[PDB]
Design a protein around this ligand. Sequence first.
Ligand SMILES: Nc1ncnc2c1ncn2[C@@H]1O[C@H](COP(=O)(O)OP(=O)(O)NP(=O)(O)O)[C@@H](O)[C@H]1O
Ligand SMILES: Nc1ncnc2c1ncn2[C@@H]1O[C@H](COP(=O)(O)OP(=O)(O)NP(=O)(O)O)[C@@H](O)[C@H]1O
Ligand SMILES: [Mg+2]
Ligand SMILES: [Mg+2]
Ligand SMILES: [Mg+2]
Ligand SMILES: [Mg+2]
Ligand SMILES: [Mg+2]
Ligand SMILES: [Mg+2]
Ligand code: NA
Ligand code: NA
Ligand code: NA
Ligand code: NA
Lengths: 327, 327
Amino acid sequence: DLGTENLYFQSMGEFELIRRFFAAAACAAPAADVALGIGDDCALLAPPAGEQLAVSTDTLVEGVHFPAGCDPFLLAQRALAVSASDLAAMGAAPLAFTLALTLPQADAEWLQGFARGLDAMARQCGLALVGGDTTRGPLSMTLTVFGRVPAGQALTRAGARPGDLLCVGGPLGEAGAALELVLERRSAPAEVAEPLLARYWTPAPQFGLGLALRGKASAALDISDGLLADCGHIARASGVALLVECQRLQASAALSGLLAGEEALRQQLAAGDDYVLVFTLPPEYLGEIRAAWPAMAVIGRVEAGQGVHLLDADGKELIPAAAGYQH
Amino acid sequence: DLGTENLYFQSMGEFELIRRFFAAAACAAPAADVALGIGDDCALLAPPAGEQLAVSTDTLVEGVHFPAGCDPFLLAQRALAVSASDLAAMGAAPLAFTLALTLPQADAEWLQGFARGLDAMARQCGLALVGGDTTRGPLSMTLTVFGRVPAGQALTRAGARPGDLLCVGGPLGEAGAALELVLERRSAPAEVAEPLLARYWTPAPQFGLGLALRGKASAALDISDGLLADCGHIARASGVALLVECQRLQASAALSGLLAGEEALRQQLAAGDDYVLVFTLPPEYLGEIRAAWPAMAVIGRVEAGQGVHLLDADGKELIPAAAGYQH
Ligand SMILES: Nc1ncnc2c1ncn2[C@@H]1O[C@H](COP(=O)(O)OP(=O)(O)NP(=O)(O)O)[C@@H](O)[C@H]1O
Ligand SMILES: Nc1ncnc2c1ncn2[C@@H]1O[C@H](COP(=O)(O)OP(=O)(O)NP(=O)(O)O)[C@@H](O)[C@H]1O
Ligand SMILES: [Mg+2]
Ligand SMILES: [Mg+2]
Ligand SMILES: [Mg+2]
Ligand SMILES: [Mg+2]
Ligand SMILES: [Mg+2]
Ligand SMILES: [Mg+2]
Ligand code: NA
Ligand code: NA
Ligand code: NA
Ligand code: NA
């Protein structure tokens, strides 16, 4: 060979170098049920026979689902956790995900921090990064998550039945409170700020609860938009009434650390971004689910009828004063 | 019942009404191997036993992968087709997809046209729409496509071997030529404009070729960035040299209709957006693949070595005059 006549500078440019932050990420390593990870036109998933693949996609847009200029290490954890919460909402076991990242141009420090946070949440969630896309534009990420669940055992939003208990998998309103700190509308000491901020940036997807509920919950989903709003999805898909007992909404120590009374209750009822499951449960399974997931709480019940109903201590229904208002 | 004490205006707002364009789309109908489509936290896919799920994601950003203000009916077809091309690149049979759509606000006429075009391409591709996400922000779409392929039979980018033929599945450069028309940098009569524009807005994913190549091609991918660039992925993953014979790049009737000589050859070599497969093939399978896919063409060969090599009629290597230039 003479050392000449080689073709270069046709490809493998800036966005290839960006892509390599993810090809080299710890969460891109080989993993169970992944026959082919990053590097080809598709990833290949191989859930053990009899198991279906649960698939969900979520998009986070800069300025909409997270603040501009935020720590990329926290942002990557938040993006993966909120997306992975939908697998828990089905009772699926975590398997893998793809990352479609759009960004204006390379930023090496941003990407290093983003990839490091993605590794941490992925390890926490047991999710392999198996593919993705890297594109130029205003900052955005679309994560598509994959889990496995035996046929017929997925948790669905229909099936809530009158007589069932209405339950949640953990404290509500904490991410809404945390947003007050994130936006610096309020201050707090570390003992208050740290637990709440962890709920905004690193909500733990409730995989264990979803798995515990297989064959037991009559219906479930994860609270992303707000307690009362997401109860409406069960009520409508199941054709029943969901009753929420306002007295059973215990504000957490962390929530009470920053907010009190009505402000706290409003966060519980309507903040969303909780990524805690809401589920309906035949009463015969209460003890088991309490043992499997002690953070769970009964907040109400299911009856024949329509709609979501917030009840005060005397059983009377609470209605916002005007259309569009909240409690 | 008294008709009072009902909770509304907490949810089911503007972006729910946007979402319904897709929940009601024809391509959201029940489909084979889809155990659960739109409506729950995850879709559930059930490929028949022994078959793996091939998964790919692609993002199209307004102004980057399509022009601002373009026909949404054409845009939805383009978005789904370019994403579905990665299933053909694996030899997967099409199954389903999710649509993550980001848009500034509702636009009823845009959405009606977008959903109508998505139905057409989905029917053409045999893809069920099973889930997605709808978010506010600068216009963008991330499509995640799912196909099925028997274990061990997927087409991969490694495995090209010296002695193999280098082939493509159809004419090259047509979408690059079409872009001249899309941007109105050139004019053409309908007999020229219509075939080229169809390649930009409605490239047909080469599912049949990918399926025909199972167990026969030694390596393959789809040309998205450009002939020479994407040949480099096979060369590097397989550890071989790919030789492209410049004389074997026949400009199509449609391509020749608008451009001639070098301008046409440059489109063939570097336009990308072809969404035609490039593949390496043991010579013993040439006749079969020609019969299965008559648009296919031999363009070169594989040898021991490194890199991609463009050769002229005398076998001498063509090199751009300076780094960054193209032929
Ligand atoms: N951000 C990312 N995270 C993880 N994997 C990625 C990412 N971007 C790309 N990939 C993977 O890297 C490989 C190359 O993808 P990519 O670089 O997007 O190809 P491409 O030339 O851009 N063609 P296309 O994106 O399909 O139009 C594939 O296996 C992808 O799944
Ligand atoms: N553009 C879309 N195309 C197809 N299906 C969609 C689309 N947007 C949402 N879906 C589906 O519609 C159902 C409701 O999703 P969605 O309205 O996004 O829930 P959400 O309240 O916004 N929670 P989340 O998106 O997970 O934070 C699910 O089954 C989704 O997969
Ligand atoms: Mg490809
Ligand atoms: Mg979601
Ligand atoms: Mg790409
Ligand atoms: Mg959900
Ligand atoms: Mg692609
Ligand atoms: Mg949504
Ligand atoms: Na989802
Ligand atoms: Na979302
Ligand atoms: Na892909
Ligand atoms: Na892409």
